[PDB]
Design a binder for this molecule. Sequence first.
Ligand SMILES: CCC[C@H]1c2ccccc2C=NN1C(=O)/C=C/c1cc(Cc2cnc(N)nc2N)cc(OC)c1OC
Ligand SMILES: [Ca+2]
Length: 166
Amino acid sequence: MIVSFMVAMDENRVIGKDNNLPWRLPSELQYVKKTTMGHPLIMGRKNYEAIGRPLPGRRNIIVTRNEGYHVEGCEVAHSVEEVFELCKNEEEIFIFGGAQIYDLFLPYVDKLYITKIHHAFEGDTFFPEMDMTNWKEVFVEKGLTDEKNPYTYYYHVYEKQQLVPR
Ligand SMILES: CCC[C@H]1c2ccccc2C=NN1C(=O)/C=C/c1cc(Cc2cnc(N)nc2N)cc(OC)c1OC
Ligand SMILES: [Ca+2]
């Protein structure tokens, strides 16, 4: 299965403030919806609670250590192992964040969908550093900037650099 990171972050890798997005870009979220259609969304509990509702049309899988945690319309996993078990047959899954959730799936990640917002916000949580020399850009696109989407931002997609033998 393809393990994909789905992330939107600013110039300093901010991905959150107080728990919410420091920015409001409806068009970005529509890109998320289009891209993840028919694939599982994997997210930490805090991240899911910040969004408020199950995102329709996808397996919403919430990752928490809490064995008692349950929520309507969502599945719950308590470890990476359980997530991979649950997505046994999936073609591609999207790690939807929680800085800590990205860290858990780092050893397995195959594809990066990264929205880079060209602005510096106030934030308290960050997309962990990554050595991008292992990664190759396969797609880029300038996001729609307008009245409802004030900032400038870009969709980037990365796959693994293949490496030429000695
Ligand atoms: C309204 C239409 C889209 C709707 C939706 C409906 C169905 C299926 C998927 C989605 C996508 N999200 N949708 C939302 O309202 C909320 C998205 C959201 C997300 C993220 C994470 C995220 C944000 N962005 C990126 N690129 N990576 C990401 N990992 C964080 C949020 O608050 C912290 C969110 O809520 C503001
Ligand atoms: Ca892998």
